Amino acid sequence: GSPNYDKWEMERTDITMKHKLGGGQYGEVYEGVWKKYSLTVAVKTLKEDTMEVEEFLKEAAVMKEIKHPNLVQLLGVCTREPPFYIIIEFMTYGNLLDYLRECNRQEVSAVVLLYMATQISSAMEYLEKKNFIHRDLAARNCLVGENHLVKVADFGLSRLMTGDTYTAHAGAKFPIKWTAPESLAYNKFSIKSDVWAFGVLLWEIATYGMSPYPGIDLSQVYELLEKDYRMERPEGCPEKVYELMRACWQWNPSDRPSFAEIHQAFETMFQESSISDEVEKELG
Numbered sequence: 001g002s003p004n005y006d007k008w009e010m011e012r013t014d015i016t017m018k019h020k021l022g023g024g025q026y027g028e029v030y031e032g033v034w035k036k037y038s039l040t041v042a043v044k045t046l047k048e049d050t051m052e053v054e055e056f057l058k059e060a061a062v063m064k065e066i067k068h069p070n071l072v073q074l075l076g077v078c079t080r081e082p083p084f085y086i087i088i089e090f091m092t093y094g095n096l097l098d099y100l101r102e103c104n105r106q107e108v109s110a111v112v113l114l115y116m117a118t119q120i121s122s123a124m125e126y127l128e129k130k131n132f133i134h135r136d137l138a139a140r141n142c143l144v145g146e147n148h149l150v151k152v153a154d155f156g157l158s159r160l161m162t163g164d165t166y167t168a169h170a171g172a173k174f175p176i177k178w179t180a181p182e183s184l185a186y187n188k189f190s191i192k193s194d195v196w197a198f199g200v201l202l203w204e205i206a207t208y209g210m211s212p213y214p215g216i217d218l219s220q221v222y223e224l225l226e227k228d229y230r231m232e233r234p235e236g237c238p239e240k241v242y243e244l245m246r247a248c249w250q251w252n253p254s255d256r257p258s259f260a261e262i263h264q265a266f267e268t269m270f271q272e273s274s275i276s277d278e279v280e281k282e283l284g
């Protein structure tokens with residue numbers, strides 16, 4: 001309506017900033033409130049101060065293109081002057097890994113685990129359709145809201161998480177146990193390497209958040225996969241889910257299913273499971 005208008009830019013002072021979320025392990029992300037709309041939000045900030053600026057602007061540019069119920073949805077940014085903000089709606093229960101690790105398993109039952117897998121595969125089919133590559137798909141990068149809503153996110157954690165999730169590899173930091181063989185060896189990433197990660201993410205969901213490849217040194221992971229060793233089916237994981245899991249972990253990326261195929265398979269399984277569940281609960 002005026003020369004300097006940008007439909008994504010918000011006024012920083014519209015937001016009340018509160019506490020840092022995730023103890024620093026998720027970088028500079030704060031809880032906030034968009035006062036005018038009575039909406040609790042999460043806010044990522046750069047905070048002045050030279051040097052990370054390009055990747056912050058790239059993240060904002062990417063998020064302006066992503067609109068899907070199971071992917072985080074940009075509400076606004078402040079990128080005219082520092083501190084920069086990227087703002088999305090707050091998701092009540094935080095990241096999926098800690099959610100699985102702290103949940104009430106009578107509440108988060110097999111049918112809910114399938115619902116969450118289904119939602120994640122929906123988000124990935126959307127990204128695949130748009131030709132985007134996630135590059136770090138894992139439970140720690142998924143978010144949980146009310147009624148077991150899941151949204152895929154990305155917190156650029158390689159630089160931020162401490163401990164052994166990420167370790168030095170090809171000069172950067174890789175989550176070795178989520179990383180496709182072609183990505184570890186040849187540094188090639190694609191939607192098929194995301195598919196491989198999705199398989200590991202399915203194993204996280206099935207085990208309620210166990211760390212992958214239990215008791216195996218990160219240094220032996222590539223050699224094992226090369227011999228065709230794969231993680232075993234976790235207790236209680238249905239056979240059909242383990243089969244999809246195994247397809248995601250085919251050595252040759254072109255041999256992995258597409259997210260369109262995966263999502264179709266989950267929707268089927270979830271609908272099957274939902275029926276069987278309404279029936280069994282309808283006893284009493």
Ligand SMILES: Cc1ccc(C(=O)Nc2ccc(CN3CCN(CCO)CC3)c(C(F)(F)F)c2)cc1C#Cc1cnc(C(N)=O)n1C
Nearest residue numbers: 021042043044072086088090091094133134135152153154
């Ligand atoms: C404030 C905030 C800002 C940004 C994001 C965010 O997820 N950014 C993002 C950036 C890029 C991409 C896609 N690319 C990945 C890299 N790729 C590299 C290139 O291969 C390109 C494709 C995606 C994706 F994956 F979802 F689409 C998300 C999350 C939050 C949050 C939050 C929040 C909500 N509730 C809570 C809570 N309770 O504590 N918190 C913490």
